[PDB]
Amino acid sequence: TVDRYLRQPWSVVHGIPMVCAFAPNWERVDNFQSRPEDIVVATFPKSGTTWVSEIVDMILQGGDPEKCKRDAIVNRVPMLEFAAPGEMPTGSEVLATMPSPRVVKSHLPAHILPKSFWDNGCKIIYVGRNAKDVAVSFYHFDLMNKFEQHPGTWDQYLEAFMAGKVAYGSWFDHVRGYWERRQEHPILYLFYEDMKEDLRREITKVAQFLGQELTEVALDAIAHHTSFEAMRDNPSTNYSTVPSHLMDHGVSPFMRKGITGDWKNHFTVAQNAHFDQYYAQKMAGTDLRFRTEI
Numbered sequence: 001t002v003d004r005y006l007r008q009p010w011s012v013v014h015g016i017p018m019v020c021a022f023a024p025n026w027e028r029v030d031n032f033q034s035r036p037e038d039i040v041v042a043t044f045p046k047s048g049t050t051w052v053s054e055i056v057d058m059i060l061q062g063g064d065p066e067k068c069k070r071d072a073i074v075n076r077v078p079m080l081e082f083a084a085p086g087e088m089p090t091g092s093e094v095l096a097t098m099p100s101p102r103v104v105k106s107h108l109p110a111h112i113l114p115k116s117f118w119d120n121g122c123k124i125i126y127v128g129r130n131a132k133d134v135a136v137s138f139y140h141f142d143l144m145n146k147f148e149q150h151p152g153t154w155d156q157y158l159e160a161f162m163a164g165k166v167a168y169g170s171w172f173d174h175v176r177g178y179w180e181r182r183q184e185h186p187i188l189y190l191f192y193e194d195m196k197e198d199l200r201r202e203i204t205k206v207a208q209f210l211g212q213e214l215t216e217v218a219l220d221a222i223a224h225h226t227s228f229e230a231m232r233d234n235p236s237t238n239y240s241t242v243p244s245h246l247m248d249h250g251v252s253p254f255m256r257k258g259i260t261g262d263w264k265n266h267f268t269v270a271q272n273a274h275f276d277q278y279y280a281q282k283m284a285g286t287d288l289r290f291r292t293e294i
């Protein structure tokens with residue numbers, strides 16, 4: 001029943017390209033009923049959502065890794081806009097029956113994140129990642145994830161990415177929207193590259209934002225269990241439990257490489273020069289900055 005939605009071109013919701021299966025019945029998102037205690041993990045796709053979601057869940061579980069092995073991360077931190085009509089309950093439905101504090105994953109740009117989150121002051125942990133690594137990660141994700149329109153060749157996908165035609169729209173607008181919105185809302189704005197550089201330093205910031213005090217032993221336990229190698233090999237986080245019909249893990253694993261700088265292996269000399277020139281144009285006039293190497 002979900003098959004007719006898979007591998008279809010993007011729909012559009014409020015002007016933003018959307019995964020085809022997610023777009024029907026968008027009222028369930030516009031009218032989502034949030035709670036003041038909800039913690040939103042918001043990201044442009046492929047920017048560290050799963051990484052930060054696991055950190056948050058481990059903090060809320062007191063640093064106990066066994067409690068995070070209870071279920072897969074797709075169920076522990078439901079995506080707000082997820083839907084697979086006819087095969088699974090929507091993410092919004094699953095969230096309705098989840099005890100506070102809920103951890104809510106989403107890729108929606110700030111201006112179409114449901115109004116209830118803004119009205120309830122919900123804590124948002126935002127993660128940004130440099131756009132070149134994001135583009136590489138999202139291309140390979142679209143090769144393996146059958147919810148996505150097929151991406152074609154890398155060069156054509158990159159053009160679509162730069163133009164903001166991909167699911168969830170323009171990366172530039174996404175990262176700058178949440179950077180600006182912190183002026184009116186409690187947002188912790190994290191960088192994937194910072195997390196590669198010093199993971200404990202970023203876990204500590206997440207714990208403080210959540211009001212949670214970590215012993216040194218719990219901090220080391222969280223850092224040890226949220227390394228790329230740990231989450232790649234952990235069935236609860238590596239998405240290997242997703243049916244192969246939805247995610248072909250042999251095309252490209254979800255936990256694919258986990259580095260900063262893989263863009264140097266995929267961007268041609270010409271693509272890189274052109275991207276850098278466009279990026280400088282699009283990022284002029286913001287103080288927000290990303291690192292492409294650490």
Ligand SMILES: Nc1ncnc2c1ncn2[C@@H]1O[C@H](COP(=O)(O)OS(=O)(=O)O)[C@@H](OP(=O)(O)O)[C@H]1O
Binds near residue numbers: 049051226
């Ligand atoms: N612990 C840890 N350390 C380092 N890197 C990590 C980690 N967990 C996930 N990743 C990498 O993040 C990419 C997945 O991003 P998301 O989780 O945002 O994907 S999604 O939007 O939720 O589908 C994807 O990046 P790439 O490997 O570059 O494709 C994952 O490998």
Ligand SMILES: O=[N+]([O-])c1ccc(OS(=O)(=O)O)cc1
Binds near residue numbers: 133292
């Ligand atoms: O993709 N980025 O995030 C990106 C690209 C270029 C850039 O600066 S440059 O000096 O390498 O052009 C910084 C960040």
Ligand SMILES: O=[N+]([O-])c1ccc(O)cc1
Binds near residue numbers: 147
């Ligand atoms: O996080 N996710 O599972 C995703 C992310 C992007 C996308 O286009 C579809 C699903």
Ligand SMILES: O=[N+]([O-])c1ccc(O)cc1
Binds near residue numbers: 147242246247
């Ligand atoms: O939980 N799931 O089955 C999923 C979740 C996200 C996704 O992109 C594809 C499948």
